[PDB]
Amino acid sequence: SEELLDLFNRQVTQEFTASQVYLSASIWFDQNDWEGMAAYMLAQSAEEREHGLGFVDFANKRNIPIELQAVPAPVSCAEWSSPEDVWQSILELEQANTRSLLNLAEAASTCHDFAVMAFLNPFHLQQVNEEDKIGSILAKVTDENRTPGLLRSLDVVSF
Amino acid sequence: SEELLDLFNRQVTQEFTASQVYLSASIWFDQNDWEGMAAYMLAQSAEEREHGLGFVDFANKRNIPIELQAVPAPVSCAEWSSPEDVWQSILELEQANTRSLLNLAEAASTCHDFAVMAFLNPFHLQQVNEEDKIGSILAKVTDENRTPGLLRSLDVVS
Amino acid sequence: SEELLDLFNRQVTQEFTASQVYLSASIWFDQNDWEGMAAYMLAQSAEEREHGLGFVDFANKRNIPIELQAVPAPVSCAEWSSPEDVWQSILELEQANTRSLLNLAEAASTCHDFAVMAFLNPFHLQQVNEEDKIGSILAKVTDENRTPGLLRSLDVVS
Amino acid sequence: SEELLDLFNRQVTQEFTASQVYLSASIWFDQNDWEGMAAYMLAQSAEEREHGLGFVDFANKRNIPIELQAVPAPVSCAEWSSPEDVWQSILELEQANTRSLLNLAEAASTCHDFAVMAFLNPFHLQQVNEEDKIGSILAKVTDENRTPGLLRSLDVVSF
Amino acid sequence: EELLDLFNRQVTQEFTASQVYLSASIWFDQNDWEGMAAYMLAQSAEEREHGLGFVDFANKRNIPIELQAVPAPVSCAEWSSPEDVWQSILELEQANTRSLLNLAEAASTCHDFAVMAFLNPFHLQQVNEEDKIGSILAKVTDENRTPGLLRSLDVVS
Amino acid sequence: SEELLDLFNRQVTQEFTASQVYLSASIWFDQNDWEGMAAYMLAQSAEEREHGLGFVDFANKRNIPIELQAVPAPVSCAEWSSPEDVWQSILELEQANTRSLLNLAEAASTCHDFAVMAFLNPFHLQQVNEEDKIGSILAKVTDENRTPGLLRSLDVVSF
Ligand SMILES: [Fe+3]
Ligand SMILES: [Fe+3]
Ligand SMILES: [Fe+3]
Ligand SMILES: [Fe+3]
Ligand SMILES: [Fe+3]
Ligand SMILES: [Fe+3]
Ligand SMILES: [Fe+3]
Ligand SMILES: [Fe+3]
Ligand SMILES: [Fe+3]
Ligand SMILES: [Fe+3]
Ligand SMILES: [Fe+3]
Ligand SMILES: [Fe+3]
Ligand SMILES: [Fe+3]
Ligand SMILES: [Fe+3]
Ligand SMILES: [Fe+3]
Ligand SMILES: [Fe+3]
Ligand SMILES: [Fe+3]
Ligand SMILES: [Fe+3]
Ligand SMILES: [Fe+3]
Ligand SMILES: [Fe+3]
Ligand SMILES: [Fe+3]
Ligand SMILES: [Fe+3]
Ligand SMILES: [Fe+3]
Ligand SMILES: [Fe+3]
C-alpha cells in the first residue's frame, strides 16, 4: 500500500493547491472590483484548506505518514482577463479535485481499505455538489456577460 | 513649527471642503433622480464634517490655534453630466484628502511630533479604505453605464 | 420668481454661515476652558447645519435650483475677550437668521407661494424659541460675570 | 540600545514618581478639607501606577531588563499653600511625564524600534488629554479663587 | 520597488509560517502530544489569517500581489523531542518579526505612513507571540528534565 | 507622642516598600517564565499599596501628619537565582511588616491610644494569615523543587 499512502499524502497537497488557486481568484476579482465574487472565492479558499486539514487529521489517526509538500504558485491569474476566465479555471480545479479523490478511492478499493473508502464517501458527494454549483455559476456568468455592464448586477445582488 | 500649524489648519479646511463637495454631489444626484447615490453622498458629507471636527478637537487639546477659513463654493457641480463625472470628482477629492494627510504627517515627522503622528494613523487607514471603496463604485458605475438604463439598477438596489 | 429662488439659496448660505460661527464660538470657549459653553456651541453648530440641509432637501423636491456658495470665514472671534462677547455675537447671529427667514417668507407671500410659506412655519417658531433661549443665557452670563469666578462655577452646568 | 533601555527603565521611575506626587497632593488636599480634589488626586495616583505597570509588562515581554529605582520623597507639598499651587505642580508633573515619553520615542525612532514606537502611541495621546484636562482644571481653580470661599463650590458640586 | 516586493514577501512568510505550524501539529499528533498539536493547529490558522490581512490591505492599497509557492516545511524531518519543535517555532516567529521590521523600514524610507500604521498591531502582536512561545519553550525544557513529567503539560491542555 | 507619629509614618513607608519588593518578585518570576507566581506577586504588590493607603487615610482623619518618604529600590532581585530564594525573601518581608505593626501597636498602647489600637486589629490578624500562607507556599516550593521540573509543572496548575 505504498501507492495508497502516497496518494493520500498527495491529496493534502491537492486541496491546499486548490485553496491557493481560490485565493488567487479572490485577488483577481478584488483588484477588478468584483467584491461579491471575491468573497465567494475567499470562502472557498478556507473550505479547501479545511478539506486538506481533514485528510491530515485522518492520516494522523490512521498512521499514514504525512509529509507536507510545496504548495505550488497559482499561475492561471496571469491569463485571466474576464470573470468567465476565472470561473472556468475554478471549474477545472474542482474537476481535478474530483479526479484526485476518485484515484485515491480506486487505490483504496484495490487495497481493500474499507476505512479509507468510508472516509472518502462524503468527499465524493461534496465534489458532486461543488461541480454542480460552480458549473451553474459559470453558465450564469457567461450568459449575463453578453450584455455590457450586466454581469456587475450578479456581483452586487448575489454574493 | 509654522509649517506644522499651518498644515493642521488647512486640514480642517480640507475636510470641510470635502463635506461641501459631497453635499454638492448629493444635490446633483437628487436633481437627477439618483436618490440612492444622493443618500450615500449625503452620508459622506456628514462623515467629512466629523473628520474636520476631529481635527478641531485635537488641535484645541494640543494648543494648536485654529482659525476657521472660508469653505469655498464647490466647483465641479457646474460641469457634471452623468453619474460617472460625479464619482470621478469624488475619487479625486478623496485622493486630495489623502495627499493632504500625508503632507501633514511628513511635517509632523520632521518636527518629531509623535502625538500628531499617532493622532493621524487612523485617518491614513480610513483613507485607504475610502479610496478603495470609491474607486470600486466608480468601476461599477462605468461598467454598468455601458447599457442604457442599467445604471438606474445600481441606484434602486444597493 | 428670481427673488424667491435667490433668497431660498441665500437661506442655505445663512444656515451654514451660522453653523461655522457657532463652531468658532465653541473653539473660543474650549481654548479658554469653558467646556460646557463649548459643548453647547458645538451642538448648535450641528443644528444649524441641519437647518441648511432641510432647506436644500425642500429645494430639491420643489425644483428650486441650489447652488452652494462659499461659506465665509467667521471673524467675530478676533474680537471676543469674554464669554459675554461670544453670547452677544450668537444672539445677533440668530437675529440675522430670523430676519433672513422673514425676508424669505415675505417673497414667498408676494408670490402667493403657499407651499414655501407652510414649509417655513416651523422655522419661524423655532427662531422664537432660539432667540428666547440665547437671550436668557446672555442675561445670566452678564449677571454672573459681575462677581469674579462666579461664571466659571456655572459653566459646570455642563 | 544602551540609551533606549535606560530611557525605558526611567519611564517606569517617572510614572511611579508621578503616582507618589499625586498621593502627596491627595494628602495636602485632605488635610486642608478639599475632599473632592483629594479623591481626584488619589484616582490619578492609581492611574499613574497603572501606566508604570504597563511599561513593566511590555518590558518583560520584550526582554527589556527592568531594574526598579528608588521612588524619591515628594517635596512640592512642603511649599504648597493653596489649591492653585498644587494644581500647578500637577500640571508640571504631567508635562514632565509627556517630555519623558517623547524622549523615549525619539530614542526608539533612532533605533528603528517600531514595536516600542507603536506601544508608546496611546501614551502620547493620553498625555495630550491629561495635559488638557489638568490645564482646564487649573484655569477654573485660578478663576474661582478670586472670590473668597467660591472655590469650595468646585470641590463639593463637581469632584 | 523594494516596498512592493517586501509586501509580497510578507504574504509568503506568513503562509510559510502557517505550514510550519501545521508540520509541528503533525509531529505532535504522531507522537501523542495532542495538547501541543491543538495549539500548533490553532497557530497555523492564525498565521494564515495574518497573510490574508496583508493580501486584503494590499488589494485596497493597489499593491499588486502575486502569490508565490509556499515552501515545504523542512524542520520536521529532524525533530526528535518537543523541545526541538518549540525551538523551531520560536525561530520561525523571530523570522516573522524580522521580516515585519524590514518591511516597516522600507515603508519608513518611503514615508509610507499608511503602511507603517497598518503594521503597528502586527509589531505588537509579534512581541506577545515571541513572549508566549519563549515561555512555553522554557517550561518544556525544564519539565523534560524528568522522564514522563512533560506529558503533564500536555494533558493540562 | 512623637514616637507614635514617627512609627505611623514608618508604617506607610514599610507597606509601600513591600509593594515594590513584591513588584520586583513579579518581574523576576516573569523574566524567568513563572507566570503564575508572577501574577500572585503582582496581586500582593497591589494589596500592600492598599494597606499603605489605608494608613494614610486613617492618619489624615486622625490628624497624624504624614510626610511621604523615599521608597527604596528593591535590591534582593540581584541575588535571586531560584523561586525558593524569592519566596524566602517575601516571607522575610511579611515578617518585617508584622514587626513594624507590633512596634506601632506597642507605642499606641503606651500612649493609651485606643483608636489606633482598634484600627490596627484587622492588620494584626491579616498578618497572621499572610505569614501562614507565604510560609505554606515556601514549604511547597521547597519540596517540589527537589525534583527537576516538578515545580514548573505546578506554577502552571496552581496560581
Ligand atoms: Fe475590494
Ligand atoms: Fe466543509
Ligand atoms: Fe476540496
Ligand atoms: Fe472544492
Ligand atoms: Fe429625491
Ligand atoms: Fe476626510
Ligand atoms: Fe473622505
Ligand atoms: Fe476642552
Ligand atoms: Fe436637528
Ligand atoms: Fe438656523
Ligand atoms: Fe439657530
Ligand atoms: Fe478628608
Ligand atoms: Fe486606568
Ligand atoms: Fe488607564
Ligand atoms: Fe503617566
Ligand atoms: Fe498622568
Ligand atoms: Fe492525536
Ligand atoms: Fe504571523
Ligand atoms: Fe505568529
Ligand atoms: Fe510573561
Ligand atoms: Fe485589597
Ligand atoms: Fe485587603
Ligand atoms: Fe502590608
Ligand atoms: Fe503583606
Side-chain angles (χ1 to χ4, degrees):
Chain A
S1 80
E2 52 275 347
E3 186 207 359
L4 176 60
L5 302 213
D6 170 49
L7 282 192
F8 204 104
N9 189 73
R10 279 158 86 278
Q11 189 65 29
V12 168
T13 311
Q14 177 68 27
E15 297 297 337
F16 288 162
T17 295
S19 176
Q20 285 294 98
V21 173
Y22 275 110
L23 178 56
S24 190
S26 86
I27 300 172
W28 188 92
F29 280 133
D30 237 292
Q31 287 170 336
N32 289 281
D33 306 301
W34 300 91
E35 289 89 5
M37 292 175 197
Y40 184 93
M41 289 313 176
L42 191 69
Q44 287 296 287
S45 181
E47 178 80 9
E48 293 295 357
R49 178 162 187 273
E50 287 308 307
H51 297 162
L53 296 171
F55 276 77
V56 167
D57 182 36
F58 185 87
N60 290 345
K61 294 189 300 195
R62 233 291 292 275
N63 313 113
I64 291 170
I66 287 301
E67 204 179 328
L68 288 177
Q69 298 180 317
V71 184
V75 292
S76 290
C77 180
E79 96 215 328
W80 291 333
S81 50
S82 68
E84 341 185 355
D85 290 340
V86 192
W87 285 102
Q88 176 65 47
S89 289
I90 286 309
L91 183 54
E92 298 162 13
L93 175 69
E94 294 291 2
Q95 296 161 341
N97 282 354
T98 303
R99 282 185 304 278
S100 59
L101 286 161
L102 298 169
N103 288 345
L104 180 64
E106 197 89 62
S109 189
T110 291
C111 284
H112 295 43
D113 193 324
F114 297 98
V116 169
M117 287 185 282
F119 178 67
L120 294 179
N121 284 341
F123 294 91
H124 299 309
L125 291 180
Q126 170 78 356
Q127 289 307 109
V128 169
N129 295 340
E130 288 187 11
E131 287 187 31
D132 174 66
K133 187 82 194 299
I134 297 298
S136 176
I137 294 159
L138 175 63
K140 299 186 194 347
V141 163
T142 297
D143 197 19
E144 289 179 36
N145 202 210
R146 300 190 219 281
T147 295
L150 185 59
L151 181 67
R152 289 291 169 185
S153 340
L154 186 56
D155 192 69
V156 173
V157 173
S158 327
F159 303 124
Chain B
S1 69
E2 213 273 340
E3 188 202 15
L4 176 66
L5 312 196
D6 178 66
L7 289 181
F8 208 106
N9 266 267
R10 226 188 302 209
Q11 186 68 32
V12 172
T13 306
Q14 182 65 33
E15 300 292 343
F16 295 159
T17 296
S19 179
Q20 284 292 98
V21 168
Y22 273 115
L23 180 61
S24 76
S26 75
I27 291 160
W28 188 91
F29 282 137
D30 230 82
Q31 288 168 344
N32 296 272
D33 301 308
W34 296 92
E35 292 88 350
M37 290 178 193
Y40 182 92
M41 290 310 177
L42 192 67
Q44 278 299 307
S45 179
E47 174 80 10
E48 297 288 2
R49 173 155 191 282
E50 292 304 316
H51 298 160
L53 296 180
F55 279 75
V56 164
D57 183 47
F58 188 81
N60 293 340
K61 295 186 303 192
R62 236 294 296 277
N63 309 119
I64 296 165
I66 290 298
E67 302 227 300
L68 290 180
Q69 305 166 333
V71 187
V75 180
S76 294
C77 41
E79 300 293 347
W80 294 331
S81 285
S82 63
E84 184 179 336
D85 294 340
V86 194
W87 287 101
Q88 170 67 41
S89 296
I90 288 309
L91 179 60
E92 288 166 20
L93 179 68
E94 294 287 4
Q95 288 165 348
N97 286 350
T98 304
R99 288 189 301 271
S100 65
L101 288 163
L102 292 175
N103 285 342
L104 184 51
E106 204 81 80
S109 184
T110 297
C111 289
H112 298 323
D113 195 329
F114 293 100
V116 170
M117 290 191 286
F119 170 70
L120 298 175
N121 283 342
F123 289 92
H124 299 310
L125 295 178
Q126 173 81 353
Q127 285 314 107
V128 170
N129 292 338
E130 287 183 14
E131 289 187 26
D132 172 71
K133 178 165 194 184
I134 296 300
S136 174
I137 291 177
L138 170 66
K140 294 176 186 28
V141 165
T142 302
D143 199 13
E144 291 185 30
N145 203 215
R146 291 156 65 204
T147 296
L150 180 57
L151 183 66
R152 212 59 91 159
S153 100
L154 193 63
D155 189 73
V156 174
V157 191
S158 15
Chain C
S1 160
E2 276 308 322
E3 185 75 302
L4 173 65
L5 154 66
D6 183 47
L7 290 174
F8 206 102
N9 270 268
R10 292 208 278 202
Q11 195 60 34
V12 173
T13 306
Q14 178 68 24
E15 304 292 347
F16 290 165
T17 293
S19 179
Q20 288 286 94
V21 172
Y22 277 113
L23 180 59
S24 190
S26 80
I27 291 161
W28 190 93
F29 282 129
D30 251 317
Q31 289 169 344
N32 292 279
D33 307 298
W34 299 94
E35 284 88 11
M37 288 175 199
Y40 184 92
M41 298 307 179
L42 192 64
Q44 277 302 292
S45 184
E47 171 77 14
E48 300 288 6
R49 179 168 187 274
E50 288 310 313
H51 297 167
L53 292 179
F55 276 81
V56 162
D57 182 46
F58 183 90
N60 287 350
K61 294 188 297 187
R62 242 292 293 280
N63 306 118
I64 291 168
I66 292 296
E67 193 152 354
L68 295 179
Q69 303 305 322
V71 188
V75 292
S76 302
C77 178
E79 300 293 333
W80 294 333
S81 59
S82 66
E84 296 104 281
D85 293 339
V86 191
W87 287 101
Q88 175 64 41
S89 293
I90 290 310
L91 181 56
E92 289 163 17
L93 177 72
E94 291 289 2
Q95 292 169 340
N97 288 348
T98 296
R99 283 188 311 269
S100 61
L101 285 168
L102 297 171
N103 287 347
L104 181 55
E106 201 66 77
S109 187
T110 289
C111 291
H112 295 266
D113 193 326
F114 298 99
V116 171
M117 289 188 280
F119 175 69
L120 299 175
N121 284 339
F123 291 94
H124 296 309
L125 293 176
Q126 171 106 285
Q127 282 314 107
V128 178
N129 290 349
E130 291 188 7
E131 292 191 21
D132 174 73
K133 183 62 145 17
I134 299 296
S136 165
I137 293 164
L138 171 61
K140 300 180 181 17
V141 165
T142 293
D143 196 15
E144 299 182 38
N145 203 216
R146 292 162 62 214
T147 297
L150 181 58
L151 187 60
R152 200 64 91 155
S153 66
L154 287 77
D155 187 70
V156 185
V157 162
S158 191
Chain D
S1 246
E2 59 119 72
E3 209 41 43
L4 180 58
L5 313 185
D6 290 339
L7 288 178
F8 202 106
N9 269 276
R10 288 216 280 293
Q11 190 68 32
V12 170
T13 306
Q14 177 67 26
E15 308 290 339
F16 292 161
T17 293
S19 177
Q20 279 289 86
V21 176
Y22 274 116
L23 176 64
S24 179
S26 84
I27 290 167
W28 188 88
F29 283 129
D30 234 291
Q31 289 171 337
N32 289 282
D33 308 299
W34 303 87
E35 283 87 3
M37 293 181 190
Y40 181 90
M41 292 316 168
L42 189 66
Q44 279 302 299
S45 182
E47 181 68 9
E48 300 292 359
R49 176 163 193 277
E50 286 313 311
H51 297 164
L53 292 178
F55 279 74
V56 165
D57 179 48
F58 184 86
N60 290 347
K61 288 172 179 171
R62 237 294 292 275
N63 308 116
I64 289 167
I66 289 300
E67 68 166 298
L68 289 174
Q69 295 295 320
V71 190
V75 65
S76 298
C77 181
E79 308 272 79
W80 293 331
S81 312
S82 66
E84 178 174 2
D85 289 342
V86 189
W87 286 103
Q88 175 65 42
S89 289
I90 291 306
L91 184 57
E92 291 167 11
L93 177 72
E94 290 293 359
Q95 290 170 346
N97 289 348
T98 300
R99 174 185 304 142
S100 169
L101 289 163
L102 292 175
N103 291 340
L104 176 59
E106 190 66 70
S109 186
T110 290
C111 288
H112 298 288
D113 199 324
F114 292 104
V116 169
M117 283 184 286
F119 174 72
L120 295 181
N121 287 341
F123 290 95
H124 300 309
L125 299 177
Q126 175 72 10
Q127 289 304 113
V128 169
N129 291 345
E130 286 185 6
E131 289 192 28
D132 172 66
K133 177 168 168 62
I134 297 295
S136 174
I137 292 163
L138 177 62
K140 297 168 179 32
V141 167
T142 301
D143 201 10
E144 295 187 37
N145 206 213
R146 298 167 107 284
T147 289
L150 182 60
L151 186 61
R152 297 274 172 190
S153 95
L154 194 53
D155 197 65
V156 325
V157 94
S158 178
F159 288 125
Chain E
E1 175 84 75
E2 164 187 287
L3 177 70
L4 158 53
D5 170 56
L6 290 176
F7 208 102
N8 272 276
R9 284 212 249 152
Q10 191 67 36
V11 172
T12 309
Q13 177 65 27
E14 300 300 330
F15 291 163
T16 300
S18 184
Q19 284 292 91
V20 178
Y21 276 109
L22 182 55
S23 78
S25 76
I26 297 165
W27 185 95
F28 280 132
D29 232 80
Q30 288 174 338
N31 288 283
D32 305 303
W33 300 95
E34 283 84 10
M36 291 178 197
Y39 184 90
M40 291 310 181
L41 188 75
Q43 279 296 282
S44 179
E46 178 82 14
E47 300 283 16
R48 169 158 198 281
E49 288 304 317
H50 294 174
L52 295 176
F54 276 82
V55 165
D56 182 47
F57 180 86
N59 289 345
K60 293 184 304 184
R61 242 289 295 280
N62 311 304
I63 297 162
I65 291 296
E66 289 196 312
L67 295 176
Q68 302 300 289
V70 192
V74 312
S75 294
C76 177
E78 301 297 321
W79 290 335
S80 300
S81 65
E83 173 165 15
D84 292 334
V85 191
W86 287 99
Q87 173 71 41
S88 290
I89 290 305
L90 180 64
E91 284 166 21
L92 172 68
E93 287 297 355
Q94 290 169 341
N96 284 349
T97 302
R98 283 191 309 275
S99 83
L100 282 164
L101 290 179
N102 290 344
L103 176 55
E105 286 273 18
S108 176
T109 306
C110 289
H111 308 290
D112 192 329
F113 298 98
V115 167
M116 289 189 283
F118 170 72
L119 298 176
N120 287 338
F122 298 89
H123 296 312
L124 297 176
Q125 168 81 316
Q126 287 314 102
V127 170
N128 288 347
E129 288 187 5
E130 289 186 29
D131 176 69
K132 175 171 188 35
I133 301 303
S135 170
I136 291 164
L137 179 58
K139 299 162 176 35
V140 164
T141 295
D142 200 9
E143 299 188 27
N144 212 203
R145 299 161 68 214
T146 290
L149 183 60
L150 186 62
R151 290 280 175 195
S152 98
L153 194 68
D154 195 66
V155 84
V156 180
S157 283
Chain F
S1 162
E2 263 291 343
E3 184 209 15
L4 180 60
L5 156 65
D6 176 49
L7 289 178
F8 213 96
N9 276 271
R10 282 190 192 281
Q11 193 65 30
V12 174
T13 307
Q14 176 64 29
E15 304 291 347
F16 289 164
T17 298
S19 177
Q20 289 292 94
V21 167
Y22 269 114
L23 183 57
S24 182
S26 86
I27 291 165
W28 186 96
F29 284 135
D30 265 325
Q31 290 175 330
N32 288 287
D33 304 301
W34 295 93
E35 286 84 9
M37 292 175 199
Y40 186 84
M41 291 305 178
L42 196 63
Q44 279 301 304
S45 179
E47 178 68 13
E48 298 291 7
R49 170 167 197 275
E50 294 300 321
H51 297 169
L53 296 176
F55 275 79
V56 171
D57 178 58
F58 182 81
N60 289 344
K61 292 189 304 190
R62 242 292 292 276
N63 304 307
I64 296 173
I66 291 297
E67 184 181 306
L68 298 172
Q69 300 294 329
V71 197
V75 287
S76 295
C77 174
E79 296 290 347
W80 294 331
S81 50
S82 60
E84 178 177 352
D85 292 340
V86 183
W87 286 99
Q88 174 69 40
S89 291
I90 289 313
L91 178 57
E92 291 167 15
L93 176 70
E94 291 292 2
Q95 292 169 338
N97 292 349
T98 304
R99 287 197 293 283
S100 66
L101 287 167
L102 295 178
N103 292 340
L104 182 52
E106 196 73 82
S109 179
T110 292
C111 279
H112 299 253
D113 195 322
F114 297 101
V116 171
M117 291 188 284
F119 173 72
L120 297 175
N121 292 337
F123 292 92
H124 296 307
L125 294 181
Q126 164 128 71
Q127 294 305 117
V128 173
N129 290 346
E130 281 181 16
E131 288 188 36
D132 175 68
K133 179 168 174 37
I134 300 300
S136 171
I137 294 162
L138 172 63
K140 298 173 173 27
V141 166
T142 299
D143 198 17
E144 297 182 23
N145 211 204
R146 296 168 59 209
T147 288
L150 178 59
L151 187 60
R152 193 74 75 161
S153 79
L154 294 282
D155 189 64
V156 164
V157 167
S158 182
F159 295 115

